[PDB]
Structure 1
């Protein structure tokens, strides 16, 4: 096939221009993102029943919805949480590859069918079904420095003048609000209700039948009467649109024309729909707007457009209102991708330099300089064929594949040069002879590398996509590389190559051949040495930490504050304020801003939690290892242990926000007999105590829930209520409206529909004794206090009740101890769970579910890959024994990478594994080429298995050294990288360099030995 192109170079140039144009077109139509879709599709039903506890929402909302979630296709599992704030979160996780839209629509259809069974308040609030995806493209905070506007005003302004236009920006899949827009709070005063002989139910009824919209009709409407000449629609009632307009609502007139209005017994104002969460930014009040990227969209773009829109909005803002960005990841991904492109360009330049250093012919060095970029461009086209994007994983896979691209070009060009330098042939004949020499070797190498890399794309689970990205971006690169070795390089070597330090290299080569001959004189020692190398490689591989992905200092981190049970919103403050003060006083030069959010947390949503999104300055302003995120979080968590009130921990965001800590499991106890909640807590405590007796394997085994807290139970005497003439419904409505609020109806503020909330004033619903201030009107206009027909006490109840697959459950988290694989800890956990009281089951969720379901498919995939590689090698050569001489070079390339990983303290993560595979592939390529040359010399020339091998290794030494020096020097910046995004590139570079050094320093002394010892064995 290359011989078809040597005499036909214009066709090769044309079909290379096609590849270049396709790559250029695809670069612009490839999306851009920090990461692909890793987590399996999940749909999160969210419901809100205001004022309820965990038990009420579980019994009336969670169970009803869960019992109607049947008939949905490809459902891995579901887990529901019911909080004491009245919120229900049911997350259904589906199979990987399941269409997210279809799953969401099926879930929402089942929810719509189950809606009539839900309480009226839940239906009024609404139940939202939405897909869960990447955390946030960008968090657009809005602050008011002047302090004139409170947080509610800022949130209302954001909801009015920002969400409508930001959503119109291209690439913005959805937007979220960090606050509650305006909503009219009628603040009931029990003293005036008792005075004016009123009850909250009367207020609710008056507001309902004082603000509604009514259909009216038309003048001259059809059917018309004969002679009609006008037709105008009539208007009857409009919703109130002013505070004093609600103030004038008539509640009662008494008997002497009292004319008591709404404002007499209550305060009418504009406030937030929800007061649970208050957000601040460096102390001053603030708001936010969470932004999510669309499914297909640029990350560098569609984030700069948002900044442009905010800049456009800036002049049209109230005085003192400005925009800040406490969280953004566009600069980080931009810097990482720029570093990757710089690394590729540097690799091309150093290949040019080394190839001129070895081959003094300048015109020969331009052949890869043209060939190498083209393949890269083609790779992008292949991505456009498979619908991939410009991910971090894809660019790092291309970085790893550049080493195979460069040596694939160098080998053929060096062979052409060596042919015309040794035989003095014209460039065309020399190129033809060289392409004849390595005609089938390149195809065999391509098949071997495909068999090595394709099976890694078939791993199942969340980790399957991560491996698939690299597998595709490497297999496509190799498939295009073999073509560009058979197409552009021969034509360039023919039409762009003239006909017709060295001394030290010649002296070393002659000395090298003597060393190889001496080694071949006695091959016994070099086989036991190889066995020792293999044993050491196995020992290092078995004893090495494992990880998912290297956590990187993305420029931000988080601080979590967890006040004890029963803490208030103001107790989280002056503790969340101390964190801000510490960050903006003791770390002024490293921390640019902090975004404190109160009452949000991570385990629950109560008032005793909070989180601060600490955003550091630019990496240019953070010199040294002490100003990095890792070295700052430890100092923060050391300085936060002095707080003896809350429990404050500072940590760094994971590389992937979805799944992390691959060494940890996600065990979950299930109650499969209706034992209850106390018995399930006893079983969980027993399991925790039993697991605390095995510190050698299980470490930090903790529950993922909230322990029981005191609650105020009011029991109403039905007989007393009947005797006193007060209805149970009236009492319940009064209590719920006073102490929990009641979303009554809607109104129109400024052309937008806002809610109208009715709730007691703050000072009258604080202490239990305040219940004595509330009276219920009996049938005969008589007020009875709550102290007459009811009693109250304190009892322990759960603040957050969770269920798994429709059964009560308790989530237990933990990690395997160092030196112990996670699968070795899951078996111990499920052995401990087998001695629990009867009726208590167990199940694995999340990452543990993926690990248990996938099983040990990696050894099977490796076995089938090895079988296919052996078959391809036995095809390329003819004898069944020759392929062993190639398959015995893997440990030589693995041992160096293991040494580098151990010395640098790295971890056996995805990047290290892919780099190990790359080194294995390149070493196998070198062995394939050497043994092919040796076999060809033995066959076509009839040499005696010793001079043939020596000649083959002598003529193969130069390309191997050239490619090793080009590729080791091309990844040195990755190893010595210490800037932004220098944990992923360091991890992927150190292992590759370590493997590649020892895959060529000593493999050149072993492949001839392997070939010789195999040949005189069968």
Structure 2
């Protein structure tokens, strides 16, 4: 009603499915798909996905008896619905559900004590719920000639919809189910209405030898590699990378009682598998690029001896960089090398660089305006690209003017 009454001008269809959710299937889970009108009718940024989502957040935070969380589909729906780290708390010590739950609560408390490192840490599983337990006095039932199997089968059939066989309906095979009626399985008092047959053929009610009590139980159990576990989510603090907070959480787990392990899954496992082998591949790539910048201008000849000083600059170089920029720096080094190349090979420079200063800025602008489509729809997203771009272009022009002349004497 909120979507189709307050914002009819941008929504098209609301498809709500109850009893389903990403956390699993359950009576208390809800999910809704929203369809929007085409971009021709959605004009301006106020009718965009972000603005309507923000308005939905503001309006639906008023739902008192539920937690409604409108959100957009992430960039990669194959890896989850959000970012951060994915963590599994493994109970490899065979401690039990209660001990593991206490350990999880202790870890949450410890993480909340240092918000400067990890933000928004939260469990993923569901909390314990009251559950009904029926205790059957086997000795009492056996004393009056009632089989325990009959009692268990009666209860399971009445409250569990036991499946029997198949039947034909309009040329299709379909199942047959047997269950108690709706008004007979809604309250704890409903058990006292049931009867079972003894060996003599008479009936005795279930209340004669069964006792019921309220207990607690987990509605969802999680396992990892065959070991009981509970998922823990969260995101790194602002200004911090993933590795530092990840290690800090590792130490936090090291502070937990013995018998409790940990492991990373999803994106965190991928980044951990990348990081523990990244130095070796980076070293071999550096060796390969060194051979590349050692084979073209025949050995330490003119510039390749100043590129011999590049490793000192590399070793000189908590702030980090992403995977793409790690290859982007190598490509920048290569394009600077090529900016040198078609003049340095000519020398192998006055006239050569007079007729090759233009290609320097053609290649630079070609790279800039080739990575430009990756980010731009024209007009938007162009103001923030003039900071690095203009400075890099000026630095490259200065390098072309000066370095290919100083390096030969260097």
Query: Which band: TM-score by shorter chain?
Result: 0.7 to 0.9
- The counterpart of 1:883, out of the listed 299, 304, 308, is 304
| Counterpart in the other structure of 2:52 | 632
Spell out, residue by residue over 1:900-933, the C-alpha distance to the aligned partner (whole angstroms, 9 max, x if none): xxxxxxx976666666665554443223223333
1:798 matches 2:229: no
Spell out, residue by residue over 1:610-655, the C-alpha distance to the aligned partner (whole angstroms, 9 max, x if none): 1111122223322222222223222212211111100111111121
| Counterpart in the other structure of 1:655 | 75
Give the Cα separation in 2 of the matches to 1:662 and 1:765.
Answer: 40
| Counterpart in the other structure of 1:763 | 183
- The counterpart of 2:344, out of the listed 931, 934, 948, is 931
Contact 2:90 2:263 in 1 (8 A): yes
| Counterpart in the other structure of 2:237 | 817
Which runs of no fewer than 5 residues in structure 2 stay unpaired?
312-319
Contact 1:889 1:1003 in 2 (8 A): no
- The counterpart of 2:36, out of the listed 616, 633, 638, is 616
Spell out, residue by residue over 1:739-789, the C-alpha distance to the aligned partner (whole angstroms, 9 max, x if none): 110110011212221100111111111111111221112222212112111
CA RMSD of aligned residues (A): 3.0
Q: CA deviation at 1:733?
A: 1.0
| Counterpart in the other structure of 1:693 | 113
SS of the residue corresponding to residue 69 of structure 2 reads: strand
Give the Cα separation in 1 of the matches to 2:240 and 2:101.
Answer: 29
| Counterpart in the other structure of 1:960 | 360
Give the Cα separation in 2 of the matches to 1:997 and 1:916.
Answer: 17
Q: 1:649–1:888: structure 2 CA closer, same or farther, 3 Å change rule?
A: farther
Contact 1:886 1:924 in 2 (8 A): no
Give the Cα separation in 1 of the matches to 2:335 and 2:80.
Answer: 31
- The counterpart of 1:740, out of the listed 150, 154, 160, is 160
Give the Cα separation in 1 of the matches to 2:191 and 2:402.
Answer: 92
Contact 1:923 1:1000 in 2 (8 A): no
Q: 1:843–1:728: structure 2 CA closer, same or farther, 3 Å change rule?
A: same
Contact 1:663 1:822 in 2 (8 A): no
Q: 1:662–1:743: structure 2 CA closer, same or farther, 3 Å change rule?
A: closer
Give the Cα separation in 2 of the matches to 1:797 and 1:974.
Answer: 51
Contact 2:74 2:82 in 1 (8 A): no
- Corresponding pairs, count: 401
Which runs of no fewer than 5 residues in structure 1 stay unpaired?
1-580, 891-906, 937-947
Give the Cα separation in 2 of the matches to 1:804 and 1:966.
Answer: 49
- The counterpart of 1:718, out of the listed 116, 132, 138, is 138
Give the Cα separation in 2 of the matches to 1:925 and 1:605.
Answer: 59
Q: 1:625–1:885: structure 2 CA closer, same or farther, 3 Å change rule?
A: farther
Contact 1:664 1:814 in 2 (8 A): yes
Q: 1:585–1:842: structure 2 CA closer, same or farther, 3 Å change rule?
A: same
Q: 1:682–1:969: structure 2 CA closer, same or farther, 3 Å change rule?
A: closer
1:676 matches 2:89: no
Contact 1:594 1:614 in 2 (8 A): yes
Contact 2:357 2:400 in 1 (8 A): no
Q: CA deviation at 1:596?
A: 0.8
Spell out, residue by residue over 1:305-334, the C-alpha distance to the aligned partner (whole angstroms, 9 max, x if none): xxxxxxxxxxxxxxxxxxxxxxxxxxxxxx
Contact 1:974 1:990 in 2 (8 A): no
Q: CA deviation at 1:793?
A: 1.1
- The counterpart of 1:1012, out of the listed 402, 405, 410, is 405
Give the Cα separation in 2 of the matches to 1:702 and 1:878.
Answer: 59
- For normalisation by structure 2, the TM-score amounts to 0.87
Q: 1:695–1:753: structure 2 CA closer, same or farther, 3 Å change rule?
A: same
Report the structure, 1 or 2, having the larger helix content: 1
- Name which one, 1 or 2, has greater alpha-carbon Rg: 1
